[PDB]
Design a protein around this nucleic acid. Structure first.
Ligand code: MG
Ligand code: MG
Ligand code: MG
Ligand code: MG
Ligand code: MG
Ligand code: MG
Ligand code: MG
Ligand code: MG
Ligand code: MG
Ligand code: MG
Ligand code: MG
Ligand code: MG
Ligand code: MG
Ligand code: MG
Ligand code: MG
Ligand code: MG
Ligand code: MG
Ligand code: MG
Ligand code: MG
Ligand code: MG
Ligand code: MG
Ligand code: MG
Ligand code: ZN
Lengths: 224, 151, 82, 99, 211, 100, 114, 127
RNA sequence: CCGCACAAGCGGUGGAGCAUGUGGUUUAAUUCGAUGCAACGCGAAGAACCUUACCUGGUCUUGACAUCCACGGAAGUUUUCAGAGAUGAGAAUGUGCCUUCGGGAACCGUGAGACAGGUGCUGCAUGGCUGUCGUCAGCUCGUGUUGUGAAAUGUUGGGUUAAGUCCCGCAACGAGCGCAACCCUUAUCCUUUGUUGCCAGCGGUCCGGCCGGGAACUCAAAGGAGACUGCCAGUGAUAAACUGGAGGAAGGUGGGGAUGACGUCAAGUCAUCAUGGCCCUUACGACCAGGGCUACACACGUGCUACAAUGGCGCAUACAAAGAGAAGCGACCUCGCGAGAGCAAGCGGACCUCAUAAAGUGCGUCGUAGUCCGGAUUGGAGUCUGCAACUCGACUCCAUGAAGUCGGAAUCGCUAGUAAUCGUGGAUCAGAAUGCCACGGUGAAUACGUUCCCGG
């Protein structure tokens, strides 16, 4: 992504000067209208160097977890993961999604069992109310673990939108040593992101730019 | 009824007079589910109410009802912390129901050698504002108005 | 009450004893556990002890007593008030 | 001139299996079977205390539902009653063949 | 907090009876009296043959009793000569020509009777009850169960007080009628007294009634 | 209960059994009209001489399994107690808890 | 009227008026009436001597009034002096037909005591 | 053509013959009026026919054993309504808003253990 | 925040009579346990004998019941005397069977000890079973995270639900035992099915579905469909849900059951049984007869019937369901006022019988009274069952006609087919229901509310 490509999308935009985090000073161009302005001169090379690492991970058969819980951007992140055959979390992050992997696997098994059971049959054997209740549970599990049913094991890389909002995920990752790739607004604490991208995390246009560029490079890394 | 407000079930009207207020009235006169003997009494009373007490029986029924139905009530609660004789006003359905109660037991306290005779006689005397349950209706407006000092 | 068709009930050992007594003239007041049997015109001028649970109680049977059973003369309970 | 086969049992399952078997057997002899007639099942109720001592109020209620069926053949031919004597059934069922 | 016999309620639903003959009232009491007596005689006899289930069904002209055990050859002895003599003693104790037959059990640690009685036997061996019931549940769940519960009550290890305890593992849904819950009870006569043992095994759900 | 009672009952049954014919015919004689009015008399006399514990009314239903008189269920011939466990285990065929 | 009795029948239906006679219940009453063949609804009024005589004669057929009380009195009396058990209970004024002396025997017992 | 009443109710029993071209009611081979000694019964049964005002357009012949008077009356009322719908198919809404196809299931209660009556508890004495 | 907790109501209880339990006292003994809620129509689903364990007395000692050893006898039947019977005392009759001839089976008796026997003690030694809190919604764990750790979190908050029910918030995520639901039954429609059930349309009828005849309807019972907040609108974070509407037999877990978490009270039961331990053993064991449990100055609880014209009585006349039955249910006919009897049909029962529902309805009657209300109590005489109705049964008939005229303080139960009233059946049982458990008929009032009451 080129600085012009970002700037038109508005990547330079930030939170209010009232709400910023201390470690973000190096990445901040300045202030206008009491608004923090992010410096694309740092943003572009760091994003490119992160894309290099993401391409490397995906080119060694890496499993990638796209992470974002914004109600606006949930579907964008889900489609972003689907466009590169990867795994995602688009609904509220659940504590222990990575650290409590065994429980998630048991929940994955129940979701797999319910979908297999409906195809196999025995719903007719169940009472119509009972069969409907089983369908409701299957729908709820599909809404929740739709992205990670096929992750199989712990992912090899994480992509995070608004790292401050998803702070539990990054704490878990660091506890596991799983690398964190994150779009970091001025209000976030950048310590947990090993490849940090400072940029707007709310705006739909810039978020979609991040996701599309990452997914293009991930498909490229897969293709070899 | 701490969770739902429940009252009377939806009554069905007395067929031969098409109205339900009389159906409620006989549900007041009922004793041990013996509808038949009850409604017999209400009819045998409204008849001679019509004759010896001026015509239009289905109508004089309620004109007496008005002469006996009270307006002021008292629901003495611990609204101020203890027993205090508080005057209040109660919605009309409870009002006409209690009016029915007042007239019916008043009927049960006249004897008159016949039950329908008692009912008719007292209901007429009510339509004249000179009777038995009307005495305590004036008395209920004495009692609901006697200790209105503090609610 | 006993049905008329069956007739008055008496146990045979009382029959033996009373007929022996009558043929044998006045005899010792005979002893019995049978409150059941009824009084007959035979047992007249006799006296007889019936076993109340505590002890046998003598009764000089007379005529108007006929028909009634023995047990109506041996009160099987004691009481004097409080 | 008739052969009435009245069956009693304890579960509709076995009673109906037996009826099916016997009527198809009638169809083996070309009989004139009456398709099985369910009759009122009887319910023996039993209310019984459970606490050995003191608690009469505590109780339990069991019940025997004896199911009943009626089958008939209107033309008694030997070729029927032979197989009608070749019948094997579960111990749960009671049969009443009556000319 | 007293429960209800988990076997009884699931009768007809998923649990068949242990006696399937039919009769009228005239011959009813004595009928179950007879089959009770044969049950008792048998349970005295084959105590070493790991017997679990015993069902009496009586055809109109004969009676036939069936045995589910884990020690088939034991019951059969040789040429069923012990089986044949049992057939004789039952035919006379039932006063009807009998015909006994056995249907062994494959998962002896997976039915409630065998495990409960093994427990109570080891209890008579004065082994430690705790490790005992633990081995029980371990073998059970290991073998492929879905739930096991054991409960031992009364004067544990000879304690001068009745320390009733229990253990649960897996899943045992007691309020779900359609659930396959095998359940049984047995008893140990210690020097110090008598101690009760209850056992539940849940092999999962079945769908579609008794069939 | 006390096996004395169980044996007492079985003996009562044996008695009231063997004497059945004599009881029946003497019953006939006493009941029927046209008796000689002493044939009836001597008949009631000879009757009361028979073993007192030969009247069937002397018998008392007793739980066969536990020898208890109360709680008897004529249909199963058991106490109200023994029938319960006998059911829950599944011996009484077709028996089950009702709900209706 | 007198009707050969100390008591006088009330002015009511004949069956009610004649039940006033002691020892005469309803069955006995209508037995008298049909025995005289007199209707049921007549009062002691509207019934001249021509029928009163018939009534008196037909009722004199049954022991009534003073004679009856004496008879029952003698029954009870000889019961007591028989020394018979029920005669005893009559002397002690308690129920004689096998009721409860534990509780609620007050009918014969009478009023209450602490 | 043929339009029938046949009413059971809480295990009541009654049979009825409805037919266009004349209006009359006869019960149990007895005339309607002399049978249902309580008029309210003749009312509750005539109510659906009077509501549609077809009283004199089709006659009924009933005969009733099983159930009590009021139950039988309700049963034959519901049966009349069944038949009216059976007949014109047009009276669905009118009749339902009259509340006649309700088919109430208000039954008696299985008398429950330790209770004087079903839903009636013995008079326990605190004191 | 909940609960028939209060309020709102209906009906009671507390007064009377009686039935039943209990405690007290008496007794020869008045068997034993059950003791606030959660004992007191409780164990007992049924004490005349029996039961029965309790008293008086009569008895017995390897024994009433079991195994062993012997020794003898068929086994038995019928019959006599004494006795109150237990029992003794007999006399006759039979004296058999498999036997390879010894015996065995068979019982029966005698002896012999090993032994039986105990409703004797301890539910504070126990198992089992059960109540209770409470059908209350809770109770926990794995894993994770946090903390040095004890631990916390989950499970809290925001809502919402009958519900730890659901939803969002939420380092928790999941789960388990619960809740729910799978089970029964009930309310609507579809399957064969027509018998002993049915009778629409057909023919006859004696008018009786009775009889041809029908298979439709009712049913009967198998299998099924059906309701899901599914639909619309509102409300609400759009969340969950809630309100309303539509449709529909059925609407918001449709109704009612069954179903009782972890635990709580050394709760109850050693007299159901089982059982540690102690205690009895010519006796705390065993047998018989009679007696008691049914006792009268009392007290307490539970009930029944009442006190009346919404009534009583007569007359007619209606109007159900669910059951039971072969030492049984027992029709019809006769007899009896009746309780009943005789005769004897049918029925192991969709067939026959119990067994004709009562309240209702129609007419007349009574005129407000201790009454034609009430029926207690006594008198007299019967009936049935049962060896046997004195103690101490049920029922009929005649006669008698108490107290009672709505019941202090106090208190109870009930939210719909409920309450209240009316009958019906059953278990137990020779007989002995006002109890218990079911069945239907008729069929209400009221619930503003959560201030309080109590409890949670
Ligand atoms: Mg229970
Ligand atoms: Mg014993
Ligand atoms: Mg008896
Ligand atoms: Mg009389
Ligand atoms: Mg109130
Ligand atoms: Mg009282
Ligand atoms: Mg006692
Ligand atoms: Mg004791
Ligand atoms: Mg009770
Ligand atoms: Mg005795
Ligand atoms: Mg205890
Ligand atoms: Mg909350
Ligand atoms: Mg949470
Ligand atoms: Mg549930
Ligand atoms: Mg539903
Ligand atoms: Mg709706
Ligand atoms: Mg204790
Ligand atoms: Mg105790
Ligand atoms: Mg007693
Ligand atoms: Mg039957
Ligand atoms: Mg009277
Ligand atoms: Mg009812
Ligand atoms: Zn941001």
């Amino acid at each position: 992504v080129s600085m012009r490509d970002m700037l038109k999308a508005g990547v330079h935009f930030g939170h209010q000067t009232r709400y910023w985090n201390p470690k973000m000073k190096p990445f901040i161009f300045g202030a206008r209208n009491k608004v923090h302005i992010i410096n694309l001169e740092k943003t572009v090379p760091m994003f490119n160097e992160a894309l290099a690492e993401l391409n490397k991970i995906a080119s060694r058969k890496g499993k990638i977890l796209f992470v974002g819980t914004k109600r606006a951007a949930s579907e964008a992140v889900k489609d972003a993961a689907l466009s590169c055959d990867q795994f995602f979390v688009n609904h509220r992050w659940l504590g222990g999604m990575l650290t409590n992997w065994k429980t998630v696997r048991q929940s994955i098994k129940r979701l797999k069992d319910l979908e297999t059971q409906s195809q196999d049959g025995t719903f007719d054997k169940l009472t119509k109310k009972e069969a409907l209740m089983r369908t409701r549970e299957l729908e709820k599990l599909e809404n929740s673990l739709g992205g990670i049913k096929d992750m199989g094991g712990l992912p090899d890389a994480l992509f995070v939108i608004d790292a401050d909002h998803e702070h539990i995920a990054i704490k878990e990752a660091n506890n596991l040593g799983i690398p964190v790739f994150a779009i970091v607004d001025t209000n976030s604490d950048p310590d947990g992101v090993d490849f940090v991208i400072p940029g707007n995390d709310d705006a739909i246009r810039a978020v979609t730019l991040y996701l599309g560029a990452v997914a293009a490079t991930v498909r490229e890394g897969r293709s070899q | 009824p701490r969770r739902r407000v429940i009252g009377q079930r939806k009554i069905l009207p007395d067929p031969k007079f098409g109205s339900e207020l009389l159906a409620k009235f006989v549900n007041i006169l009922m004793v041990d589910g013996k509808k038949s003997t009850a409604e017999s009494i209400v009819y045998s009373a409204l008849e001679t109410l019509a004759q010896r007490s001026g015509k239009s029986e289905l109508e004089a029924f309620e004109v007496a009802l008005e002469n006996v139905r009270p307006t002021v009530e008292v629901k003495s609660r611990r609204v101020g912390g203890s027993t205090y004789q508080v005057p209040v006003e109660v919605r009309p359905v409870r009002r006409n129901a209690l009016a029915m109660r007042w007239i019916v037991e008043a009927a049960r306290k006249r004897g008159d050698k016949s039950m329908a005779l008692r009912l008719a006689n007292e209901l007429s005397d009510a339509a004249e504002n000179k009777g038995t349950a009307v005495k305590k209706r004036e008395d209920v407006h004495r009692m609901a108005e006697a200790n209105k000092a503090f609610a | 009450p006993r049905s008329l068709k069956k007739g008055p009930f008496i146990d045979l050992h009382l029959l033996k004893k009373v007929e022996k007594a009558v043929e044998s003239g006045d005899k010792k007041p005979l002893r019995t556990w049978s409150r059941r049997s009824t009084i007959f015109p035979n047992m007249i001028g006799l006296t007889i002890a019936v076993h109340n649970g505590r002890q046998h109680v003598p009764v000089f049977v007379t005529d108007e007593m006929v028909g009634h059973k023995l047990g109506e003369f041996a009160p099987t309970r004691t009481y004097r008030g409080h | 001139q008739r052969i009435r086969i009245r069956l009693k049992a304890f579960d509709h399952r076995l009673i109906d299996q037996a009826t099916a078997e016997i009527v198809e057997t009638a169809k083996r002899t070309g009989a004139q079977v009456r398709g099985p007639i369910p009759l009122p099942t009887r319910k023996e109720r039993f209310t019984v205390l459970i606490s050995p001592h003191v608690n009469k109020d505590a109780r339990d209620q069991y019940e025997i539902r004896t199911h009943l069926r009626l089958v008939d053949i209107v033309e008694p031919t030997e070729k029927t009653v032979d197989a009608l004597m070749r019948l094997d059934l579960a111990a749960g069922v009671d049969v009443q063949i009556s000319l | 907090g007293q429960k209800v016999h988990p076997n009884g309620i699931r009768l007809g639903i998923v649990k068949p009876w242990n006696s399937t003959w039919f009769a009228n009232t005239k011959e009813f009491a004595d009928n179950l009296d007879s089959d009770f007596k044969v049950r008792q005689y048998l349970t005295k006899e084959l105590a070493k043959a790991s017997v679990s289930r015993i069902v009496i069904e009586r055809p109109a002209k004969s009676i036939r009793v069936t045995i589910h055990t884990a020690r088939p050859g034991i019951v059969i002895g040789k040429k069923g000569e012990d089986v044949e003599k049992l057939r004789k003693v039952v035919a006379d104790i039932a006063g009807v020509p009998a015909q006994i037959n056995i249907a062994e059990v494959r998962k002896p640690e997976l039915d409630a009777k065998l495990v409960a009685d093994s427990i109570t036997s080891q209890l008579e061996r004065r082994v430690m009850f705790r490790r005992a019931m633990k081995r029980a549940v371990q073998n059970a769940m290991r073998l492929g169960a879905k739930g096991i519960k054991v409960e031992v009550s009364g004067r544990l290890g000879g304690a001068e007080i009745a320390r009733t305890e229990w253990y649960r593992e897996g899943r045992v849904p007691l309020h779900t009628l359609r659930a396959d819950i095998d359940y049984n009870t047995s008893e140990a006569h210690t020097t110090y007294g008598v101690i009760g043992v209850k056992v539940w095994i849940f092999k999962g759900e079945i769908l579609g009634g008794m069939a | 209960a006390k096996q004395s009672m169980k044996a007492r009952e079985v003996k009562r049954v044996a008695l009231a059994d063997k004497y059945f014919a004599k009881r029946a015919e003497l019953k006939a004689i006493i009941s029927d009209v046209n008796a000689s009015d002493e044939d009836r008399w001597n008949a009631v006399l000879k009757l009361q001489t028979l073993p007192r514990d030969s009247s069937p009314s002397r018998q008392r239903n007793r739980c066969r399994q536990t020898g208890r008189p109360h709680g008897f269920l004529r249909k199963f011939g058991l106490s109200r107690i023994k029938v319960r466990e006998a059911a829950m285990r599944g011996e009484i065929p077709g028996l089950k808890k009702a709900s209706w | 009227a007198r009707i050969a009795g100390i008591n006088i029948p009330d002015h009511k239906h004949a069956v009610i008026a004649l039940t006033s006679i002691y020892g005469v219940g309803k069955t006995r009453s209508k037995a008298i009436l049909a025995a005289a063949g007199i209707a049921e609804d007549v009062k002691i009024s509207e019934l001249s001597e021509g029928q009163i005589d018939t009534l008196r004669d037909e009722v004199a057929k049954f022991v009534v009034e003073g004679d009856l009380r004496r008879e029952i009195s003698m029954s009870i009396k000889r019961l007591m002096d028989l020394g018979c058990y029920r005669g005893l209970r009559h002397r002690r004024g308690l129920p004689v037909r096998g009721q409860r002396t534990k509780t609620n025997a007050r009918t014969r017992k009478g009023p209450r005591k602490p | 053509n043929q339009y029938y009443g046949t009413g059971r109710r809480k295990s009541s029993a009654a049979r009825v013959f409805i037919k266009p071209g004349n209006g009359k009611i006869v019960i149990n081979q007895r005339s309607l009026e002399q049978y249902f000694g309580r008029e309210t019964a003749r009312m509750v049964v005539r109510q659906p026919l009077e509501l549609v005002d077809m009283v004199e357009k089709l006659d009924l012949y009933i005969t009733v054993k099983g159930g009590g008077i009021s139950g039988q009356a309700g049963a034959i009322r519901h049966g009349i309504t069944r038949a009216l719908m059976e007949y014109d198919e047009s009276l669905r809404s009118e009749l339902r808003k009259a509340g006649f196809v309700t088919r109430d299931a208000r039954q008696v209660e299985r008398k429950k253990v330790g209770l004087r009556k079903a839903r009636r508890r013995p008079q326990f004495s605190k004191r």
